[PDB]
Amino acid sequence: DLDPECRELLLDFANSSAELTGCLVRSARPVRLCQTCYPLFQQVVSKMDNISRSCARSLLMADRMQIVVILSEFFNTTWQEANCANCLTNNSEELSNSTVYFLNLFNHTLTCFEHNLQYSEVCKNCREAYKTLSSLYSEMQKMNELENKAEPGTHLCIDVEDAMNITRKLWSRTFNCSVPCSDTVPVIAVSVFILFLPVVFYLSSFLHSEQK
Amino acid sequence: LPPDLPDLDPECRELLLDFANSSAELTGCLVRSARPVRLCQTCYPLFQQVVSKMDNISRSCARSLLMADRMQIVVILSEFFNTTWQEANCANCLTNNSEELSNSTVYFLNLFNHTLTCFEHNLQYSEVCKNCREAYKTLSSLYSEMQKMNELENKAEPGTHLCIDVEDAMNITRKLWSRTFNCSVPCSDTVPVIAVSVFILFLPVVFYLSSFLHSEQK
Amino acid sequence: NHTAFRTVEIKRWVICALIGILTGLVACFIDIVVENLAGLKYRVIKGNIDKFTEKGGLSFSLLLWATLNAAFVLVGSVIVAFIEPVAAGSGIPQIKCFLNGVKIPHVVRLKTLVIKVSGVILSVVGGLAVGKEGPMIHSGSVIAAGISFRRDTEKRDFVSAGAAAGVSAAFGAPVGGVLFSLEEGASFWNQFLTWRIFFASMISTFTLNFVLSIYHGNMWDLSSPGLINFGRFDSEKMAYTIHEIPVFIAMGVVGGVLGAVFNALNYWLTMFRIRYIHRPCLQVIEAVLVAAVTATVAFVLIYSSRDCQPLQGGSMSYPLQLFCADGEYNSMAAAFFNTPEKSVVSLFHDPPGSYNPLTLGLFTLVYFFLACWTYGLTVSAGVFIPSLLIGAAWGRLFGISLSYLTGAAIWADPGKYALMGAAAQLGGIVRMTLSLTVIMMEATSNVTYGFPIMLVLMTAKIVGDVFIEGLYDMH
Amino acid sequence: NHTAFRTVEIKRWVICALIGILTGLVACFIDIVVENLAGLKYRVIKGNIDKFTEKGGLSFSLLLWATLNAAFVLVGSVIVAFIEPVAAGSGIPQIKCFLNGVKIPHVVRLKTLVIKVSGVILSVVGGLAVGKEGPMIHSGSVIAAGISFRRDTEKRDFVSAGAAAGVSAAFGAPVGGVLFSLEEGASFWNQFLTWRIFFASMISTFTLNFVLSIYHGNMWDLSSPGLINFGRFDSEKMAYTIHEIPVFIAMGVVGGVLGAVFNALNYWLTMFRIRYIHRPCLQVIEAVLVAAVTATVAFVLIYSSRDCQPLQGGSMSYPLQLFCADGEYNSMAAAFFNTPEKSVVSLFHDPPGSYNPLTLGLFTLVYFFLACWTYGLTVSAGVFIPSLLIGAAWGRLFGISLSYLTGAAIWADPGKYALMGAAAQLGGIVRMTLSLTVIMMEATSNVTYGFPIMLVLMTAKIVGDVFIEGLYDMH
């Protein structure tokens, strides 16, 4: 066994990882990872660093199944894939202003839908509320790429992505509100005219060569 | 809104909360059993509770909890717990019924305790290896036999590990026996080895010289 | 004496080192310019489509797409038809004739290289169903014949090195390039000549890999040995059994039959163009009309496509959302907006169920006839990449059908059959098997896949030759 | 007369298919029997060593090891020295002579194949510092000349197909086998002949891969294209840039210098053997003594090695624990107990902190002279694998020094330099460069590494030829 002062770092890391894992689950269906228990992840990585700073040898690589190592790697991997750094400020102490602005806009957009539920009313009452939310989300996408120099625009903070996907699924799948202007007749007329050009060109050249 | 997208369905809220505290208990028990490794003998009830809870939640809440979003927290957490169980390899040294440790593992742990408690009262390290040598020998024979049982009853791969708590038990004993106690068996076979090796290495010298000398004349 | 021989020999290696370096640089120039110009063109088209999607007036987006395609091909066809007609096509038959021994006028002039590189850039940016890898073989030959020893015997040897360097740069197959120079040469074995051909071939693919790496900033990563990179086939999914060998032979029959039909339609089309579209003005008009029709057919398929799925990490370079839910992008648009090399790679490496058979089937049928119609145009363009895309498209459909018929069996990986389909279409069309076979292994980096590939190519060639005779007899 | 030509040609393809099938089967027979016999021998030796480790009497374990090595080689040398002297060596010079045009007696007789296959099995099981891949070329040629067209020109073409099938089976490089047949032939290009050579080579590597999979139980992973499989080289650690190119050139000089010393030592040794050890009885005694010495030199290194580290998972088959803590195997024992092909693979792919420089350095120094001494023995054995093992051993040491001298830089990966060092030794020893390089790209399945491999191989040949001229002049 380890020293009694060396069993306190492991026990503190034990309950810190226990409560972080609890929040990860109970904040999963409506994804609220980076806004509910961002400090709990910070508390875990701080407590792990405390061990790294006279117990690292006897707790970290002391055996084949490095439970402390793999659990911290798993928590780090979950934090990285969830892009929770993008959700918080560069100081990583609270939610960024852009994320906070999106969250209340998401609340306001959902506040529309309840009022207009009692689907024709929803689509024609505050459609601009959905439009401004989508404009911000696209704006935050390009800002994210230009901020961390990410090559594509793919993955934002999972809280923001889930918030928008809930809105998009509500606006398109549950409600039928998307109304794109489809000019089928002008499209057919132009496409047919262009597709009929090679017929004229091949026939005219064939007939011109005949009779010289 | 429908009670699906913005908020959890009461049927699925309670199931997710039940999986939440089950996963919290397993993670807490995983860390506190990391050193010394008592993982697969103490966390087996908690791991079975987690996998049962996940199965209960997945076949009226499977589609709204598992793949309802990109970051499938429930899926990845269960995959991590499953991966830890497989790499720790406690499937082999847990019984087929899987309510308690197998007879082999129970027989190893009590001998490991007996070997360790024999070391404790032999300090007050010459006396430790002078007296408590047969106890280490039978424990090491069991572990070597345990590997062969794993290579035959399970038949996975040569060099496959047993459950980590058993392997850590032997590594603690081996490190105690050879590193701290410094109990090494001297060898007096160096002189016969050199004599035989020198004789064999000297054979090609004779063979090449004799061939050259024989062919020097006729 | 030895002093004179060694002085000449080192200059041969020095020249063949420059041939490989310059061939790789030209491939870098073609790849960089095409990527930047096509990206600018597609951003304009995508931006215009998005503006008109909800406000109305999508017919103007179709007109802009057709005009942009026509404008680029207008320049790309005027220079080929009016200045240097020899630059038309991939230029391989001209290079094969040069290595054979017959000199076609204006094949190895510096003007031809400028027009061939400019023509292939404008033709690819012009939206034609073509590939830029084919003309790279002609470009290497012209570099070799100009950099170079002012005699016929040495010049042919250098041109062989240049053609080999072009094949190596185009596909990342230095050994395949050496094989290509060997069979087209068909001369006595020269150890030193084959050595400097290999030296030029491997220098060429390294220069392309190195310069593109610094262009991407990822100097510590060399993952672009050629213009088209198939990817890595080191997957348990990409594993075959002996029971699939008869299935692969069946794909070769399909590739041979489709390749024969591809050549049959192109043969009759070529006879029409020779008789009636021989005037340079008509060739330019025909190339412009094909480019306009290619954009129109692509737009019609995109407009009528009702299947769209959410954006992946790199599924689309320019994701086009049209008439479906927010956060989802048209799948058919990704087929046409993405570069044909990117489409081939995605078909090779994609999880099962990624492609809807209807949109993939419609794209395959349309692209098959567009590629057949596009070949023979008085533009500098190849046919290997369209042949690869056609084969991968229906090969993936074959894999999709097998998974449905065998209950989603593990061995019925659509990506694996996409590779087999791509080889079958290439085999049934180009009828060049040895150098092609080595190219696939070097592209796939999998020796074990050579055997099904070799069988598929061999089946396609013999089936294609028999079917071509039968079709001509019926006519 | 097209009907007569077709019947003749299909029979040629049928024969060339059997040549590939039988060549692969012989490779399977050699691989299966060797691993079973060597497994039985090492289990006996390991069991005997573990019995005498604590109770004393390890000198008896040394005697048992030497006797077991001598007994196998005694049978393997008697059948070669007394029955078929032509089967001695790898048979590469005999095959090159036959393909040249000059026929050596008894090269392509059926008895030679039996002696060659039996001799290579016994010599490898006999513990000699040799490899079984080299003789596989000779085995394929004899199969081709027996299955087969009873005229000299057809025999040469068929033998070249067998030799090509041997290279493909030995190394999993079907294209390398085709190249090897082309240069050793050095005749007019033949499209159909090069096709049958390519067909036979490609069947041979598939038959070996397929049958070994059946033996290994699992079938859905054809992971053994050849007798020696390098592995996968797709790692971020395993990458390079321009800055490492001059380093690779320097390592090619080392391989050429060491290869020249390897040849110079073997040349003087061969001169002694011809003058004094030309009798068949003395040849058998010499081979037995080398086998006894090889076991003895291996034992003293294993006995005196203080470096043992715990079992890190696989990487061996017979973990020998000697004089150190339980649960830890002797590091030097794994160097000799493991097959040379397995040792090469571990050197290529391993974490940068897996080899002790002293343990690896001592093994490299001893194995270099053991391999040089074992080459001229009157046994059926090759030198390709020992040269690969020597090069990978000091190549890894070069990578270890680079990590120390550059502060564990990420570009100084020892595994990458092990591969480059393996090429340098192999290129500087055999001086065959055009066929060898194609094998390496096929073996590593990475075209990006072809360029450094090319420069390393070319550098080794140039300095090797210069050094042997200087060394001979000094003598």
Ligand SMILES: CC(C)CCC[C@@H](C)[C@H]1CC[C@H]2[C@@H]3CC=C4C[C@@H](OC(=O)CCC(=O)O)CC[C@]4(C)[C@H]3CC[C@]12C
């Ligand atoms: C982004 C780039 C790669 C797009 C390509 C557009 C231009 C850079 C290309 C297209 C047409 C090319 C021209 C085609 C033909 C000529 C004529 C040629 O002059 C002659 O010696 C021949 C004159 C004749 O016989 O008509 C010199 C090169 C030049 C100007 C070429 C220069 C490069 C041009 C302008």
Ligand SMILES: CC(C)CCC[C@@H](C)[C@H]1CC[C@H]2[C@@H]3CC=C4C[C@@H](OC(=O)CCC(=O)O)CC[C@]4(C)[C@H]3CC[C@]12C
């Ligand atoms: C005159 C010859 C030489 C060419 C004839 C071409 C026709 C066979 C093509 C050209 C344009 C095509 C049309 C282009 C667009 C549409 C709209 C499409 O309707 C939708 O799906 C609208 C909703 C949506 O956008 O999803 C149905 C197919 C249709 C009529 C197509 C049917 C086939 C058409 C008429």
Ligand SMILES: CC(C)CCC[C@@H](C)[C@H]1CC[C@H]2[C@@H]3CC=C4C[C@@H](OC(=O)CCC(=O)O)CC[C@]4(C)[C@H]3CC[C@]12C
């Ligand atoms: C067909 C779809 C699914 C793919 C898109 C490709 C078409 C727009 C292309 C491919 C081949 C082309 C055809 C190739 C040859 C001809 C023959 C040509 O001349 C004749 O029909 C008369 C010849 C004579 O009288 O000898 C008229 C144009 C046409 C039909 C072309 C029209 C445009 C076609 C159908």
Ligand SMILES: CC(C)CCC[C@@H](C)[C@H]1CC[C@H]2[C@@H]3CC=C4C[C@@H](OC(=O)CCC(=O)O)CC[C@]4(C)[C@H]3CC[C@]12C
């Ligand atoms: C585990 C080991 C010790 C088993 C032994 C395997 C080989 C050493 C044996 C098995 C089959 C034997 C072969 C069986 C038949 C013959 C034919 C025989 O030819 C003759 O009858 C003529 C001999 C002559 O006069 O030269 C020569 C020996 C040879 C090749 C034998 C050589 C020794 C072989 C290869």
Ligand SMILES: CC(C)CCC[C@@H](C)[C@H]1CC[C@H]2[C@@H]3CC=C4C[C@@H](OC(=O)CCC(=O)O)CC[C@]4(C)[C@H]3CC[C@]12C
């Ligand atoms: C007569 C010619 C042709 C051959 C000469 C051979 C010697 C140079 C070799 C053969 C055996 C070797 C010895 C083998 C073993 C050892 C034991 C070693 O020390 C130990 O006792 C370590 C072993 C352990 O306890 O693990 C020191 C080197 C030494 C004397 C070696 C020194 C070098 C020796 C004498």
Ligand SMILES: CC(C)CCC[C@@H](C)[C@H]1CC[C@H]2[C@@H]3CC=C4C[C@@H](OC(=O)CCC(=O)O)CC[C@]4(C)[C@H]3CC[C@]12C
């Ligand atoms: C560093 C060593 C321990 C690695 C293992 C290899 C040696 C055991 C081998 C390699 C080369 C062999 C030598 C090759 C040639 C000779 C020369 C030979 O003597 C002569 O030829 C004498 C000629 C004369 O007297 O003119 C005696 C055997 C010997 C030393 C051999 C003895 C065994 C050697 C040293």
Ligand SMILES: [Cl-]
């Ligand atoms: Cl052409």
Ligand SMILES: [Cl-]
């Ligand atoms: Cl082409």
Ligand SMILES: [Cl-]
């Ligand atoms: Cl192309």
Ligand SMILES: [Cl-]
């Ligand atoms: Cl020989």
Ligand SMILES: [Cl-]
């Ligand atoms: Cl060998």
Ligand SMILES: [Cl-]
């Ligand atoms: Cl050899």
